[PDB]
């Protein structure tokens, strides 16, 4: 469907080079968003572009967005679109409980989101959303961490770790070496440390650019502050000095 | 579904509206002047034949008893806006507040109608620029211009159509902040005397004022509370008498 | 859109369950009409309304509804006068008023006597709240209508002048007398403005605070 | 029921009066006249979408013969994505 | 026609952003005790009515104001929608609308006009200003894309880049509203295309607290008040 | 039965609601409503209110003042009667205003009538609670004095109506958010 | 919360007044125009919300505050809209033309018929005790202090003299450039 496969030269059908491919191009240009599972948590992390000197930090939105007391969403691609995509998911979840005496399931928050994205692909000269998302959390009455990715076409998939946006090859390469699916990070601290190491390779400057949200069972949602992720960054940088000086020559 | 009109041209321009301002720029000139105690709006009547009876083609129009309008551009577009503008004054404001809307609230509503025609599939923007002039108890006398874009502007004086740049230069040269309504009438009659395509007399020229209240034109006595129309359309004999003072 | 029934069921439980629903004000008093020589007089004992300068009404039944319909139709008559470039005819207002009273099925409780001058001449009609119509040289509505009609018939003759019509109008009103209680009249005469004629006949403990 | 006698009549008045008019034009002028008038109204309604304006349309008042007439419904009137995905189908 | 460029970028939004890049400059600055808004107005018309009550600057409710770069015809549709939403919130909650809820409300409508192909986007950039108890004095910006951002000082429209550099070097977190008056006037005089700043070319406003503990007050300055801050500041085009 | 009682104190609001579902909904970390009435309409109306305030709290990452939830509750109660014969409903909203450090109490009737209260009741009471409350009530009453006033008030209700009401659930809003307190 | 209650309104030389029962005022204001509403308390509060909304939007759209006579036409046309199921109220508008200085008082039935008495206005159940007191105590062209005196003694005398421990009255006295709210207790 692309590149050097061409019978009697070639000509195009209705097919591949299409609005949804250009929405995938918009997603790749948006900041890096990562998520990793643990034994009994899931951590989502994002790249802030380094804030401008006149920007107002106390009111700046947390990039990782809570959809409900047990569900978290982060994105890469178009911010305006993600704001319109989070609103639909939030009201969809609040409406779920009001009509089903049941909080929304993480898998229904992923099928709905990718589902609405698919309808703006299908037809009408309404464009698809220039957005790809991580959806993470827990179901109610369960202790299994969940983590889904959705794409502009409305395709979605489950991951034990994933990355989307800028430079995400290099991050997925690091995760494939550092995330073992038999023995995932056994504690929240190690899960957070793995996301800070993962992001430290791709972020612009350092602790400014990382921001993380930790989801735990029973609605224990918890953003980490700048000061908490500065002590993770500093501990990881201490271990780099220790590893270098533990050279034997 | 690849459906809209008046989309953006790469230099940050709306295009179709630009072509709609070329239709306005081709019309018989109209103009307006604000004075200390009144306002004037004026235009020429261009006959399709000298067998036509231009007592039927009014160009200067009453919107409410204190508000007048005139156009340059496509007259058909102006007959349809004027009747929506009249309906708006009654339905939005008179029937809620028991008093007619100001000349800033009715100009906003006319402009909202012209903006909706730019931002649509299926419809071209209007081929008219409208001058709307009037009085209100708290704003006082006012004059506004509205263009195919739905942009509206408050003016001290203005002109639109073929002769508009020479008219606007004469209006800058002659306008001062102490004019009275008889003075503004003379300046407006002087300005149309340069822009006239045909003959100049009381039959070819349209001229209206919003001035003092005229209790004669209310057509019923007994209610001083009701002051009587500020808007008055000059009779063809008054225009010929003032055109004898020229 | 229009007149809503939002608290219709809400007020069907309030009256049932002992809140006195506020009294709608009613003008039950005498109203008359006079197709006098070269014009038409109407009178009532706040109560005389204009559909346009040359067309006026007197109202009976609910006060708010007589004002409300005459002001709605006065808007449509003004817009139609602007649309057609012609003075508004009494038959056009009568058609609008009567056709509007019919859409509302007499739940708009306006009973109305309509008079005016137009390019055709001088006209006089009356509409009941279910949207049905009378015509005559003289008409009367309200509680004193028996006595008023006896006086109207007893003295009307062709070529009644202004002064004599105004006397008959005022005597048919005063025959309704033994809210309201002195004459307002309007006189519509074919060459002339509608002439409207009003009334033709240490203690306690204080604290205080300043506010804007 | 407890519901006002006039409510269902005034709810459907605008539709009922045009539906009744189209049947008179079918009868007096033949099927071509309401086929013409319904297609003009279809072009005007279907090519005139703007999520922030709900206050009718200028040409629909010309077509409907409402260009100089006020009802109580015109003086007393009564999400852009929800409008978009209704106009296009969901 | 709301289709993506092959880079995943929207041609219409870029052309609407080219349009506002001509559309007159506006500065907003957030002091420790109030917000300042200022805008520069190209009065090339003698007969245009200066001392008209608004063009660039507008009230959205009793504690929120905006500056406009872009088409004023487009801006007034959004401004009315925001005014309706502010009063509909006040009617519902009996409380004045929080600034974030309203700024992002106008950012959600402006994104919709960029997705459906029957609609052109809105050619407008807004520098919002206001007070509420949830945060305090807040300064936000929103643009034709539906993006919005929080700032301590920002410019929109023409000459944004020169203005941002001038803000950045003189802004202090602890400055008072009268220092922000001075700064916004200096910045505009150091950014203007016109030879010197004057009271009719300038639209001004403030969001102070005053003397009385419950007050927040939004003086949208009349021309004579602007002449006083001009002659006090040393811009002082004075006899 | 369906009784609701209220005894707001210097630094708390105490909501007592009849034992049977609680018929009192946590709207936020510092707001309770209690409600009484026709069991179908009130339970469904309370869940509609809760879903709208949960949606606000998630959408903002913020709390909604006890005033603003109350005026929202009156506006939605009034808006639900504009096509309907009035259902029997009474709402007693108590919450803690964390931007002014005051506990607050509001009552809303079926007609949508807000009143801001020291103390309140509905459903199954006469002047016996209101006289007993007005004699003993104080602006600066402590939470322990408030629980004793509520015990006196429940005892007065029990003495006058010796049938089995299975006691009542008591709940407190203060600086520490919702506390369910055991009382008998 | 108490349903019903009374409002009274009165004119003086360049001044107005609005008395009302306390023991939540019936009397709201929208800039220099005051609105005392009697009747069902839900409709009094729903009308306060509705007129606050309409009048804030008016001030925003029109660059000036709503005058007493304009507000009279707005309250009557808004009340009339509710024709088949009205607001169970007796509104009493008041206010001093900001461009004239003339006192204005008006009052309405539940669908908006305008009274415009030049002396005094009453609203609420058992009005006609106060109508007699107010007609007995009124005189034309008072000063503001005598105008306060006549309206306050009308409220006191027509008051239930059996329950005067449950009393409390708010009297707004409204002038051209000044408004004083006196609360008044026995």
mmCIF file of C-alpha atoms in Angstrom, chain C residues 26-181:
data_model
loop_
_atom_site.group_PDB
_atom_site.id
_atom_site.type_symbol
_atom_site.label_atom_id
_atom_site.label_comp_id
_atom_site.label_asym_id
_atom_site.label_seq_id
_atom_site.Cartn_x
_atom_site.Cartn_y
_atom_site.Cartn_z
ATOM 1 C CA UNK C 26 -60.687 43.194 33.958
ATOM 2 C CA UNK C 27 -62.332 46.237 32.307
ATOM 3 C CA UNK C 28 -66.021 45.192 32.466
ATOM 4 C CA UNK C 29 -67.286 48.798 32.025
ATOM 5 C CA UNK C 30 -69.179 50.352 29.080
ATOM 6 C CA UNK C 31 -67.579 50.908 25.668
ATOM 7 C CA UNK C 32 -69.457 52.546 22.698
ATOM 8 C CA UNK C 33 -69.073 53.420 18.951
ATOM 9 C CA UNK C 34 -70.592 56.141 16.656
ATOM 10 C CA UNK C 35 -70.328 56.064 12.810
ATOM 11 C CA UNK C 36 -71.122 59.846 12.842
ATOM 12 C CA UNK C 37 -71.255 62.168 9.789
ATOM 13 C CA UNK C 38 -67.910 61.992 7.895
ATOM 14 C CA UNK C 39 -66.099 59.993 10.665
ATOM 15 C CA UNK C 40 -66.544 57.682 13.733
ATOM 16 C CA UNK C 41 -66.467 58.354 17.528
ATOM 17 C CA UNK C 42 -65.545 55.698 20.150
ATOM 18 C CA UNK C 43 -65.527 56.013 23.921
ATOM 19 C CA UNK C 44 -65.084 54.256 27.281
ATOM 20 C CA UNK C 45 -65.276 55.342 30.934
ATOM 21 C CA UNK C 46 -55.962 53.805 29.956
ATOM 22 C CA UNK C 47 -58.792 52.045 28.042
ATOM 23 C CA UNK C 48 -58.547 53.412 24.450
ATOM 24 C CA UNK C 49 -55.829 51.834 22.266
ATOM 25 C CA UNK C 50 -54.158 52.568 18.869
ATOM 26 C CA UNK C 51 -53.547 50.085 16.041
ATOM 27 C CA UNK C 52 -52.323 53.089 13.988
ATOM 28 C CA UNK C 53 -52.858 56.896 14.102
ATOM 29 C CA UNK C 54 -56.233 56.615 12.263
ATOM 30 C CA UNK C 55 -57.417 53.283 13.816
ATOM 31 C CA UNK C 56 -58.301 53.006 17.485
ATOM 32 C CA UNK C 57 -60.054 50.560 19.785
ATOM 33 C CA UNK C 58 -61.836 50.322 23.120
ATOM 34 C CA UNK C 59 -61.272 47.064 25.068
ATOM 35 C CA UNK C 60 -63.291 44.981 27.550
ATOM 36 C CA UNK C 61 -62.508 41.717 29.362
ATOM 37 C CA UNK C 62 -58.888 41.096 30.530
ATOM 38 C CA UNK C 63 -56.955 44.399 30.497
ATOM 39 C CA UNK C 64 -53.557 42.871 29.634
ATOM 40 C CA UNK C 65 -55.077 40.916 26.669
ATOM 41 C CA UNK C 66 -56.837 43.997 25.165
ATOM 42 C CA UNK C 67 -53.507 45.892 25.338
ATOM 43 C CA UNK C 68 -51.462 42.850 24.202
ATOM 44 C CA UNK C 69 -53.471 42.012 21.014
ATOM 45 C CA UNK C 70 -53.923 45.666 20.014
ATOM 46 C CA UNK C 71 -50.143 46.182 20.386
ATOM 47 C CA UNK C 72 -49.283 42.946 18.486
ATOM 48 C CA UNK C 73 -51.673 43.816 15.620
ATOM 49 C CA UNK C 74 -50.489 47.466 15.756
ATOM 50 C CA UNK C 75 -46.996 46.103 15.031
ATOM 51 C CA UNK C 76 -48.249 44.043 12.033
ATOM 52 C CA UNK C 77 -50.301 47.017 10.752
ATOM 53 C CA UNK C 78 -47.229 49.342 11.018
ATOM 54 C CA UNK C 79 -45.023 46.780 9.202
ATOM 55 C CA UNK C 80 -47.708 46.279 6.509
ATOM 56 C CA UNK C 81 -48.068 50.079 6.069
ATOM 57 C CA UNK C 82 -44.260 50.218 5.584
ATOM 58 C CA UNK C 83 -44.366 47.174 3.211
ATOM 59 C CA UNK C 84 -47.257 48.396 0.992
ATOM 60 C CA UNK C 85 -46.515 52.187 1.231
ATOM 61 C CA UNK C 86 -50.282 52.814 1.964
ATOM 62 C CA UNK C 87 -52.307 53.912 5.040
ATOM 63 C CA UNK C 88 -53.566 50.865 7.004
ATOM 64 C CA UNK C 89 -57.212 49.962 6.317
ATOM 65 C CA UNK C 90 -59.672 49.184 9.123
ATOM 66 C CA UNK C 91 -60.742 45.985 7.300
ATOM 67 C CA UNK C 92 -57.046 44.846 7.361
ATOM 68 C CA UNK C 93 -56.743 45.400 11.120
ATOM 69 C CA UNK C 94 -60.168 43.753 11.663
ATOM 70 C CA UNK C 95 -58.960 40.738 9.651
ATOM 71 C CA UNK C 96 -55.685 40.560 11.669
ATOM 72 C CA UNK C 97 -57.348 41.137 15.130
ATOM 73 C CA UNK C 98 -60.226 38.675 14.347
ATOM 74 C CA UNK C 99 -57.822 36.086 12.752
ATOM 75 C CA UNK C 100 -55.428 36.406 15.780
ATOM 76 C CA UNK C 101 -58.323 36.070 18.289
ATOM 77 C CA UNK C 102 -59.321 32.855 16.445
ATOM 78 C CA UNK C 103 -55.789 31.274 16.649
ATOM 79 C CA UNK C 104 -56.051 31.754 20.440
ATOM 80 C CA UNK C 105 -59.642 30.266 20.697
ATOM 81 C CA UNK C 106 -60.906 32.881 23.234
ATOM 82 C CA UNK C 107 -58.232 32.007 25.827
ATOM 83 C CA UNK C 108 -57.055 35.540 25.020
ATOM 84 C CA UNK C 109 -60.025 37.284 26.687
ATOM 85 C CA UNK C 110 -60.064 40.568 24.707
ATOM 86 C CA UNK C 111 -63.481 41.900 23.573
ATOM 87 C CA UNK C 112 -62.854 44.836 21.254
ATOM 88 C CA UNK C 113 -64.637 47.702 19.395
ATOM 89 C CA UNK C 114 -62.568 48.867 16.402
ATOM 90 C CA UNK C 115 -62.969 52.115 14.517
ATOM 91 C CA UNK C 116 -61.028 54.259 12.090
ATOM 92 C CA UNK C 117 -60.615 56.287 8.915
ATOM 93 C CA UNK C 118 -58.698 55.088 5.853
ATOM 94 C CA UNK C 119 -58.518 56.019 2.111
ATOM 95 C CA UNK C 120 -61.897 54.214 1.598
ATOM 96 C CA UNK C 121 -63.831 56.169 4.318
ATOM 97 C CA UNK C 122 -64.849 55.677 8.005
ATOM 98 C CA UNK C 123 -65.499 52.153 9.444
ATOM 99 C CA UNK C 124 -66.741 50.576 12.751
ATOM 100 C CA UNK C 125 -66.612 46.854 13.808
ATOM 101 C CA UNK C 126 -66.531 44.711 17.021
ATOM 102 C CA UNK C 127 -64.800 41.375 17.761
ATOM 103 C CA UNK C 128 -65.679 38.909 20.562
ATOM 104 C CA UNK C 129 -62.947 36.757 22.176
ATOM 105 C CA UNK C 130 -63.791 33.566 20.146
ATOM 106 C CA UNK C 131 -62.932 35.570 16.934
ATOM 107 C CA UNK C 132 -66.483 36.413 15.646
ATOM 108 C CA UNK C 133 -67.556 39.809 14.355
ATOM 109 C CA UNK C 134 -70.261 42.538 14.218
ATOM 110 C CA UNK C 135 -70.771 45.634 12.011
ATOM 111 C CA UNK C 136 -73.174 48.587 12.491
ATOM 112 C CA UNK C 137 -73.417 52.400 12.628
ATOM 113 C CA UNK C 138 -73.259 52.143 16.470
ATOM 114 C CA UNK C 139 -72.083 49.298 18.798
ATOM 115 C CA UNK C 140 -71.641 48.754 22.579
ATOM 116 C CA UNK C 141 -70.001 46.104 24.840
ATOM 117 C CA UNK C 142 -69.548 45.649 28.635
ATOM 118 C CA UNK C 143 -72.177 45.384 31.403
ATOM 119 C CA UNK C 144 -74.035 48.664 30.568
ATOM 120 C CA UNK C 145 -74.586 47.579 26.905
ATOM 121 C CA UNK C 146 -78.404 47.132 27.154
ATOM 122 C CA UNK C 147 -78.884 50.666 28.459
ATOM 123 C CA UNK C 148 -76.197 52.130 26.165
ATOM 124 C CA UNK C 149 -77.818 50.521 23.059
ATOM 125 C CA UNK C 150 -81.252 51.838 24.067
ATOM 126 C CA UNK C 151 -79.739 55.394 24.133
ATOM 127 C CA UNK C 152 -77.725 54.925 20.888
ATOM 128 C CA UNK C 153 -80.860 53.794 18.960
ATOM 129 C CA UNK C 154 -83.115 56.420 20.586
ATOM 130 C CA UNK C 155 -81.033 59.389 19.246
ATOM 131 C CA UNK C 156 -78.896 58.372 16.209
ATOM 132 C CA UNK C 157 -79.718 59.966 12.833
ATOM 133 C CA UNK C 158 -77.767 60.365 9.587
ATOM 134 C CA UNK C 159 -75.556 63.479 9.381
ATOM 135 C CA UNK C 160 -74.904 63.474 13.168
ATOM 136 C CA UNK C 161 -72.126 66.123 13.476
ATOM 137 C CA UNK C 162 -69.020 65.798 15.756
ATOM 138 C CA UNK C 163 -70.632 67.616 18.675
ATOM 139 C CA UNK C 164 -73.854 65.570 18.511
ATOM 140 C CA UNK C 165 -71.947 62.279 18.183
ATOM 141 C CA UNK C 166 -69.810 63.321 21.221
ATOM 142 C CA UNK C 167 -73.044 64.117 23.156
ATOM 143 C CA UNK C 168 -74.608 60.743 22.214
ATOM 144 C CA UNK C 169 -71.361 58.948 23.030
ATOM 145 C CA UNK C 170 -71.181 60.666 26.412
ATOM 146 C CA UNK C 171 -74.916 60.067 27.177
ATOM 147 C CA UNK C 172 -74.678 56.365 26.206
ATOM 148 C CA UNK C 173 -71.689 56.193 28.595
ATOM 149 C CA UNK C 174 -73.446 58.140 31.369
ATOM 150 C CA UNK C 175 -76.459 55.817 30.862
ATOM 151 C CA UNK C 176 -73.932 53.101 31.860
ATOM 152 C CA UNK C 177 -73.283 55.004 35.163
ATOM 153 C CA UNK C 178 -75.573 55.377 38.241
ATOM 154 C CA UNK C 179 -62.053 51.326 38.057
ATOM 155 C CA UNK C 180 -63.518 53.409 35.202
ATOM 156 C CA UNK C 181 -66.142 56.168 35.872
#
